[PDB]
Amino acid sequence: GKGGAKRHRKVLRDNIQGITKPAIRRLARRGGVKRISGLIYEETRGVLKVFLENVIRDAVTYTEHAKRKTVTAMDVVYALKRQGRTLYGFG
Amino acid sequence: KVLRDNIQGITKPAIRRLARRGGVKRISGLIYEETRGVLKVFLENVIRDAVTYTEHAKRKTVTAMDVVYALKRQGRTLYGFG
Amino acid sequence: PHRYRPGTVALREIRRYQKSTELLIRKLPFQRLVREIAQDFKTDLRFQSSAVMALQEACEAYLVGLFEDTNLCAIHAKRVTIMPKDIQLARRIRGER
Amino acid sequence: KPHRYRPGTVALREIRRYQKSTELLIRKLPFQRLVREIAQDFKTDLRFQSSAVMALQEACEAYLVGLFEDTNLCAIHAKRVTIMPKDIQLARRIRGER
Amino acid sequence: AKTRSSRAGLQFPVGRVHRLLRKGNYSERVGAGAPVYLAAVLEYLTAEILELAGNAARDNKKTRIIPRHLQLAIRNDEELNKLLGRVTIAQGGVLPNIQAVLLP
Amino acid sequence: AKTRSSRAGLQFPVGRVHRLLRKGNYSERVGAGAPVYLAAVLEYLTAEILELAGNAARDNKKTRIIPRHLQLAIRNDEELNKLLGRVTIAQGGVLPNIQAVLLPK
Amino acid sequence: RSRKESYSIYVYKVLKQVHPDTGISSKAMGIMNSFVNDIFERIAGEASRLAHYNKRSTITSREIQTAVRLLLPGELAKHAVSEGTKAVTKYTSA
Amino acid sequence: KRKRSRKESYSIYVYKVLKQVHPDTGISSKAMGIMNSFVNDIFERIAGEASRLAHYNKRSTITSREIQTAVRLLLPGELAKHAVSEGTKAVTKYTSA
Amino acid sequence: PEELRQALMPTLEALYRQDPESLPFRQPVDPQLLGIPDYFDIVKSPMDLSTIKRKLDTGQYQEPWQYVDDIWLMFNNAWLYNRKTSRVYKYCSKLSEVFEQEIDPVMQSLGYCCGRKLEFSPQTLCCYGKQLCTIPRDATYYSYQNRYHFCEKCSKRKNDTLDPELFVECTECGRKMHQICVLHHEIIWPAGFVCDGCLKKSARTRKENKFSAKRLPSTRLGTFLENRVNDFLRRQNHPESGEVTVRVVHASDKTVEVKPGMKARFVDSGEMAESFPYRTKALFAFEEIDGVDLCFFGMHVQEYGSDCPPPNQRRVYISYLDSVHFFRPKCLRTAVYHEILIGYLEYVKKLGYTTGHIWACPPSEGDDYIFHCHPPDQKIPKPKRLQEWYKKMLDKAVSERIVHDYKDIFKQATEDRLTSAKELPYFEGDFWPNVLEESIKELEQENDLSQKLYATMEKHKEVFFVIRLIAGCDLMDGRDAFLTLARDKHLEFSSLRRAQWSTMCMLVELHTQSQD
DNA sequence: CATCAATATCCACCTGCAGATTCTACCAAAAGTGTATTTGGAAACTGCTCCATCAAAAGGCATGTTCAGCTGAATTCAGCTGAACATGCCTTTTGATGGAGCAGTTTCCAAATACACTTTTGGTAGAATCTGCAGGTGGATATTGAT
DNA sequence: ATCAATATCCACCTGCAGATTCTACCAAAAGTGTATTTGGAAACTGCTCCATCAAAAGGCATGTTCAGCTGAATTCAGCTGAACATGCCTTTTGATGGAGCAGTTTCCAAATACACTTTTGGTAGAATCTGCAGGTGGATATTGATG
């Protein structure tokens, strides 16, 4: 194998913390937020996770019906449409 | 008869009682007018669809069926009327 | 003269109107308002009694939900009195406006 | 005395910069790892399309921007300029998902 | 001479829901087990809501189920409330719920 | 001889809309003028949204419509904003707005 | 007079199976009928949509099971799926 | 082999619509996809509303009147009125064509 | 041994100063340290650049080709032991490129041609049991005594090997010199091989090569082609252009037999002849580059005389054609091809031939018509551009009033009031007889033949070209023998030196076959 | 409150690049017209249920007034925790590359219609009996404000 | 700490609109045995594209400091809460001409269902074109800081 270059990158389990501080700050700024409390970040991470539990569950349930285990962008388009959050550009 | 100006018929103690159902203790003076206005807006939203349903059905009277269908298509599903 | 503290009667009314389910707004003024709005939209219309009851119940439900949102916003602002600003805040967040 | 802008000028400057721009703000790989682990939480050995990850990213940032706008309005309503957990909790409760 | 409703053993009519599916023109073909599954799901939901309403009436010392009992049953169940989040129950009212701050 | 769209003075294909209505299982029967009316409505909506997008692009000193221009066109019109209040535009962003309280002095 | 279908007797039978000694008000039965009707409508519509995306022109048990999983959350969804599976296997076993 | 994938889109039609409106303006691939998705979504919504209206009124045929009613129901006021007028003119001149 | 060291430190220090590319090769490969215990299982020669330095300092290399072989063996080991996606593979590729750039001037400074390790392309074998099939490349194959080969459907190993180039030892200085680079043949110079440096040291010159295309037997067609090409080159007056010699090396009389289906349908009725006699001719164009004859174009044609039964009377058909993009200059190569084909069309029309047929069938990928092992950088023309090139050929031909007009085969058949397949020309190896037999078979499972012929002609009307000229050696018997000889003798045309070596090899073979 | 000055940013501009635009030819997929068949909602008439209107005795919140205690708003000041910055560093993206799945293709057997018979049965007209909480009566019992 | 005035929960009796229990129908369902059709069960496969590894850099995690953001304590004009007098606007009972809703008949323009010739659009490869992202040289407020 060789290579002589590797890294543990022990962030796989806690990928919820993988959403960086500047990323959350930029998302808050795009919403017009001027000042951010210190406890906002983990709560927004949890909200993002909850949104994932809402959307990807429907996407996966759609995926298995087509005798497939590869999620398609059309499936998540339908998942967002059925929740009142229809997304354009991926039709 | 084209009757007009019954918005005062939305009784102020009636609004107070409705807010009592909403768990509110204290009500300011302008809350009654604001609730009357938002109720009027909701009435505009619902009666428009109800009258459109009545017109499409060749009818001259408004039935509860069209009202509940309009409310349910408006995201305000109502039961008790089929 | 016996007088209750300002608030005790409010709690009593809140409990009474949360325990009950009978419609609170008067029937005749609401029916007249519905008639006036229909006339403003399209003349010579008729309304069934069941349609009026459904409209009334839906209106009470929507206003009760709005009152919940307004009360929660007022408590959020360290206040017990509801003001119109809470109402437009709730309506803007709900997306109706 | 090094130059130092007070909080509020450069803050609004970057707010305007991010509001006039449309590029993605969430990095691709960490969000992809999060979405993959959440997917395998329901069914193991799943596969993802790039366009699917793009759609997830767009939906997530759009929803988060909407939520942050709601929190900003809530904070301004409470005579404040900083969003705090009570603001977002109230916004989520009155939105209807909670 | 055995009807399909008795064969399935379910209270909900399989043939009637099959006819309703046919009439709505959801698709040009409808499977044989589709009305059975719809009847089973609807009967399960009805049984759950009815037993919850009966229990709520029992706490209310009432042997007749009323729409107030329906509201008590639906709004006290988290997932059932989520299912009927945008649905209003006629003559149901609201649950008794007041914040601790409002209490003196 | 002449296509239905050309006969009705429309750009969108009438027969294609008729076929989509047929295979979409909306109703057992579909009329001849229903696809024409629907194509006309879609044509009006498309013309309005594209002209608004072009106005936004020429305001932004750009000659090609981008999703940002589409967001500017859709959201700046409160009527279309009400039409698409529950739809998010990909790569569209948000309108530049600053709260009065957050403004300096 | 036009026939007006209602699920009154089936709801009454379910009650007698669950609560033999409990009464029903007329308003409550209408609410039950409306709930059954709109739940059935939602399930059938979303199942038809799902068949439409996958280019399926037949409504089978899989689509409606997926619809139940999508609409009903958690325990009710799993219970409905289990009862539907046993019902369909009993139907195909007879 | 006959392995040529085929997919439906309104790209050429919206392109000709643009040249009918803005001859000197182009469309990007992302913008084209957004427009196609918007057209598909609005078509699905309006057609489903028309089908719902026809089913409610025990109507097995889809005509222009129910589509106009659906447009009035869901499309916004000025937009709905203009779309109704243009559709009426189009169908009227198609009838005489 | 100090001279070889003084020559070899520069290239190796140039390799060393490439950091961090050369870092992994500075130390011996340690399996336990690097966690690769399977290194010794695959690699049989564990040694490194430090060992090369030690051997160079101690004078272990008697001559630099040993060092070149060692460094190329290390490159091959690094390439085989690691996948091309790995860092070590790309570092080894970079070091190999640097070594190739650096060694050539240094290696030439000692009097050698170059310091490159050159290996031939894999040699596709041929089957023996079936006597018609071949051994596929990059696939499992069977061998026995290294002489008999069998395929899957006719020792189990996979055919992925590279054949290194041969070496010739100098008679005077004793150096090992490549056969290809200086183009040395034992038959041409039986006295021995002398390097250029030794010849220049003694003011001597290499013996004149009489195994050349210019000394081949002369033919009227070849002479006409060569003088026309020379006149065209003189008119162009290109400084890079040289002298072109065209010789016809094959000319024999053959007969083509009617296929069984056509024989049963028409020949048995007394309407068509049993066979059509014809004369086949093969000619090649040779050019002098750097004083070396090089083959760059070739042709295979069938000529039907007046004695041939109709409808093949006065018809010529191009069975195959090939070209190599090594003609100088590059721009005038296409023009020279124009002149060669126009010269051929003028010669056949002067003889008396009235009709010409061209099949525009580009070679498939991995397939060669005449010249085996086409260069990798030579793009295979597409059918559309080939048809455009043929149209330009026809336009240039009519511009000189040599060809009256040109039409497609469908248009020619329409003008020739064709009503049956009998009127079409019958050529050996042509696609038309095969498709006619296929149509006959299809009718067997099911004017029908005429309808199928018309449909096929309209489908492939742009492929076949019909030219109206008049209006109003067993080694070259076919293209199979030459290709087989080139494959067996590794006569590749993938490079200028390899093409020149193959040209001399085929010239020597023809000269030896001439004398019996 | 007027201006020395570093810096993010807009236009004046430009030159290089991936994508949108232009063109010719191919070919399978729509598509209008014609012919024959089927149908379902508009007109035409008519029975009837419940919408709107009228009328009067009556009451319980509707309307208005009066007294006042908390309460949001205003003010002031203090602990402090995020914002902006400089620094060290580090995780990401794209390019390149093996095979894991996704439809295209071909067979064809289990499964869903059409419709002709044959049969259970759900509102529902019709009337007599059981049933459970609306309403009223009375006195036990927490609740609360300030005696 | 105790006490008097109120609203709350509750036991109990009674008239009655509504929930529940009998009898017969019948047509809209509901059930069942062939002829037919067809979305789909199932296997081998060409073709996409999905998982994985190495370097560049566009960024990300950490320590510092501070005047503003937020939070705690105090007071007040008033207004909405609580109480009460007056009453009037809505309730319910009962009846009614009739506009309007819906049951039944007929059938002709509209839609269905192929067959077919007509045309029409999405894709693959060619090669010219072009709107747009950076960045270097100005250069333009602007805000923090100096005065």
mmCIF file with all atom_site columns, N, CA, C and O in Angstrom, chain I residues 427-444:
data_model
loop_
_atom_site.group_PDB
_atom_site.id
_atom_site.type_symbol
_atom_site.label_atom_id
_atom_site.label_alt_id
_atom_site.label_comp_id
_atom_site.label_asym_id
_atom_site.label_entity_id
_atom_site.label_seq_id
_atom_site.pdbx_PDB_ins_code
_atom_site.Cartn_x
_atom_site.Cartn_y
_atom_site.Cartn_z
_atom_site.occupancy
_atom_site.B_iso_or_equiv
_atom_site.pdbx_formal_charge
_atom_site.auth_seq_id
_atom_site.auth_comp_id
_atom_site.auth_asym_id
_atom_site.auth_atom_id
_atom_site.pdbx_PDB_model_num
ATOM 1  N N  . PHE I 1 427 ? -17.184 -8.237  -56.992 1.00 0.00 ? 427 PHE I N  1
ATOM 2  C CA . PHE I 1 427 ? -15.798 -8.071  -56.583 1.00 0.00 ? 427 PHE I CA 1
ATOM 3  C C  . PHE I 1 427 ? -15.458 -9.033  -55.453 1.00 0.00 ? 427 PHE I C  1
ATOM 4  O O  . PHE I 1 427 ? -16.317 -9.406  -54.649 1.00 0.00 ? 427 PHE I O  1
ATOM 5  N N  . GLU I 1 428 ? -14.188 -9.433  -55.402 1.00 0.00 ? 428 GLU I N  1
ATOM 6  C CA . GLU I 1 428 ? -13.725 -10.331 -54.354 1.00 0.00 ? 428 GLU I CA 1
ATOM 7  C C  . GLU I 1 428 ? -13.589 -9.581  -53.035 1.00 0.00 ? 428 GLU I C  1
ATOM 8  O O  . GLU I 1 428 ? -12.972 -8.513  -52.976 1.00 0.00 ? 428 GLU I O  1
ATOM 9  N N  . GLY I 1 429 ? -14.169 -10.142 -51.975 1.00 0.00 ? 429 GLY I N  1
ATOM 10 C CA . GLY I 1 429 ? -14.093 -9.527  -50.666 1.00 0.00 ? 429 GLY I CA 1
ATOM 11 C C  . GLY I 1 429 ? -14.950 -8.296  -50.482 1.00 0.00 ? 429 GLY I C  1
ATOM 12 O O  . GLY I 1 429 ? -14.798 -7.600  -49.475 1.00 0.00 ? 429 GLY I O  1
ATOM 13 N N  . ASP I 1 430 ? -15.845 -8.006  -51.421 1.00 0.00 ? 430 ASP I N  1
ATOM 14 C CA . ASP I 1 430 ? -16.684 -6.822  -51.332 1.00 0.00 ? 430 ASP I CA 1
ATOM 15 C C  . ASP I 1 430 ? -17.873 -7.071  -50.411 1.00 0.00 ? 430 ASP I C  1
ATOM 16 O O  . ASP I 1 430 ? -18.318 -8.207  -50.223 1.00 0.00 ? 430 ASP I O  1
ATOM 17 N N  . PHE I 1 431 ? -18.382 -5.984  -49.825 1.00 0.00 ? 431 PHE I N  1
ATOM 18 C CA . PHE I 1 431 ? -19.503 -6.096  -48.896 1.00 0.00 ? 431 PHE I CA 1
ATOM 19 C C  . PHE I 1 431 ? -20.802 -6.416  -49.625 1.00 0.00 ? 431 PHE I C  1
ATOM 20 O O  . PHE I 1 431 ? -21.709 -7.028  -49.047 1.00 0.00 ? 431 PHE I O  1
ATOM 21 N N  . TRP I 1 432 ? -20.919 -5.998  -50.886 1.00 0.00 ? 432 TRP I N  1
ATOM 22 C CA . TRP I 1 432 ? -22.160 -6.213  -51.629 1.00 0.00 ? 432 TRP I CA 1
ATOM 23 C C  . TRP I 1 432 ? -22.499 -7.686  -51.829 1.00 0.00 ? 432 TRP I C  1
ATOM 24 O O  . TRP I 1 432 ? -23.669 -8.052  -51.627 1.00 0.00 ? 432 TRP I O  1
ATOM 25 N N  . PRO I 1 433 ? -21.578 -8.565  -52.248 1.00 0.00 ? 433 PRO I N  1
ATOM 26 C CA . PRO I 1 433 ? -21.943 -9.992  -52.314 1.00 0.00 ? 433 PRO I CA 1
ATOM 27 C C  . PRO I 1 433 ? -22.377 -10.564 -50.975 1.00 0.00 ? 433 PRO I C  1
ATOM 28 O O  . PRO I 1 433 ? -23.318 -11.367 -50.920 1.00 0.00 ? 433 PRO I O  1
ATOM 29 N N  . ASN I 1 434 ? -21.722 -10.157 -49.885 1.00 0.00 ? 434 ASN I N  1
ATOM 30 C CA . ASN I 1 434 ? -22.097 -10.658 -48.566 1.00 0.00 ? 434 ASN I CA 1
ATOM 31 C C  . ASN I 1 434 ? -23.498 -10.204 -48.178 1.00 0.00 ? 434 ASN I C  1
ATOM 32 O O  . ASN I 1 434 ? -24.301 -11.004 -47.682 1.00 0.00 ? 434 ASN I O  1
ATOM 33 N N  . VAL I 1 435 ? -23.816 -8.926  -48.400 1.00 0.00 ? 435 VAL I N  1
ATOM 34 C CA . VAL I 1 435 ? -25.144 -8.440  -48.045 1.00 0.00 ? 435 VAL I CA 1
ATOM 35 C C  . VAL I 1 435 ? -26.202 -9.038  -48.966 1.00 0.00 ? 435 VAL I C  1
ATOM 36 O O  . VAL I 1 435 ? -27.340 -9.270  -48.544 1.00 0.00 ? 435 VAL I O  1
ATOM 37 N N  . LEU I 1 436 ? -25.849 -9.321  -50.224 1.00 0.00 ? 436 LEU I N  1
ATOM 38 C CA . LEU I 1 436 ? -26.786 -9.992  -51.118 1.00 0.00 ? 436 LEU I CA 1
ATOM 39 C C  . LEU I 1 436 ? -27.070 -11.413 -50.647 1.00 0.00 ? 436 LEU I C  1
ATOM 40 O O  . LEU I 1 436 ? -28.220 -11.866 -50.684 1.00 0.00 ? 436 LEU I O  1
ATOM 41 N N  . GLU I 1 437 ? -26.037 -12.127 -50.194 1.00 0.00 ? 437 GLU I N  1
ATOM 42 C CA . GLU I 1 437 ? -26.250 -13.462 -49.640 1.00 0.00 ? 437 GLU I CA 1
ATOM 43 C C  . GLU I 1 437 ? -27.095 -13.402 -48.373 1.00 0.00 ? 437 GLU I C  1
ATOM 44 O O  . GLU I 1 437 ? -27.951 -14.266 -48.147 1.00 0.00 ? 437 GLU I O  1
ATOM 45 N N  . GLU I 1 438 ? -26.862 -12.392 -47.531 1.00 0.00 ? 438 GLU I N  1
ATOM 46 C CA . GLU I 1 438 ? -27.681 -12.231 -46.333 1.00 0.00 ? 438 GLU I CA 1
ATOM 47 C C  . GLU I 1 438 ? -29.140 -11.970 -46.692 1.00 0.00 ? 438 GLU I C  1
ATOM 48 O O  . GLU I 1 438 ? -30.050 -12.522 -46.063 1.00 0.00 ? 438 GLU I O  1
ATOM 49 N N  . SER I 1 439 ? -29.382 -11.132 -47.702 1.00 0.00 ? 439 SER I N  1
ATOM 50 C CA . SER I 1 439 ? -30.750 -10.874 -48.144 1.00 0.00 ? 439 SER I CA 1
ATOM 51 C C  . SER I 1 439 ? -31.393 -12.132 -48.715 1.00 0.00 ? 439 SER I C  1
ATOM 52 O O  . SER I 1 439 ? -32.581 -12.389 -48.489 1.00 0.00 ? 439 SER I O  1
ATOM 53 N N  . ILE I 1 440 ? -30.623 -12.925 -49.463 1.00 0.00 ? 440 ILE I N  1
ATOM 54 C CA . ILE I 1 440 ? -31.142 -14.179 -50.002 1.00 0.00 ? 440 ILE I CA 1
ATOM 55 C C  . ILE I 1 440 ? -31.527 -15.123 -48.869 1.00 0.00 ? 440 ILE I C  1
ATOM 56 O O  . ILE I 1 440 ? -32.591 -15.753 -48.900 1.00 0.00 ? 440 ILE I O  1
ATOM 57 N N  . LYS I 1 441 ? -30.679 -15.224 -47.845 1.00 0.00 ? 441 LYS I N  1
ATOM 58 C CA . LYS I 1 441 ? -31.008 -16.064 -46.696 1.00 0.00 ? 441 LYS I CA 1
ATOM 59 C C  . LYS I 1 441 ? -32.260 -15.564 -45.985 1.00 0.00 ? 441 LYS I C  1
ATOM 60 O O  . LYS I 1 441 ? -33.141 -16.358 -45.630 1.00 0.00 ? 441 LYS I O  1
ATOM 61 N N  . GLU I 1 442 ? -32.364 -14.245 -45.787 1.00 0.00 ? 442 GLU I N  1
ATOM 62 C CA . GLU I 1 442 ? -33.539 -13.682 -45.130 1.00 0.00 ? 442 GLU I CA 1
ATOM 63 C C  . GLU I 1 442 ? -34.805 -13.988 -45.916 1.00 0.00 ? 442 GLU I C  1
ATOM 64 O O  . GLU I 1 442 ? -35.844 -14.318 -45.332 1.00 0.00 ? 442 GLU I O  1
ATOM 65 N N  . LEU I 1 443 ? -34.737 -13.889 -47.245 1.00 0.00 ? 443 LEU I N  1
ATOM 66 C CA . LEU I 1 443 ? -35.860 -14.314 -48.074 1.00 0.00 ? 443 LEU I CA 1
ATOM 67 C C  . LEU I 1 443 ? -36.130 -15.805 -47.916 1.00 0.00 ? 443 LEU I C  1
ATOM 68 O O  . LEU I 1 443 ? -37.286 -16.237 -47.992 1.00 0.00 ? 443 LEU I O  1
ATOM 69 N N  . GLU I 1 444 ? -35.079 -16.601 -47.704 1.00 0.00 ? 444 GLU I N  1
ATOM 70 C CA . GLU I 1 444 ? -35.266 -18.035 -47.502 1.00 0.00 ? 444 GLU I CA 1
ATOM 71 C C  . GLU I 1 444 ? -36.065 -18.322 -46.236 1.00 0.00 ? 444 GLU I C  1
ATOM 72 O O  . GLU I 1 444 ? -36.956 -19.180 -46.243 1.00 0.00 ? 444 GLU I O  1
#
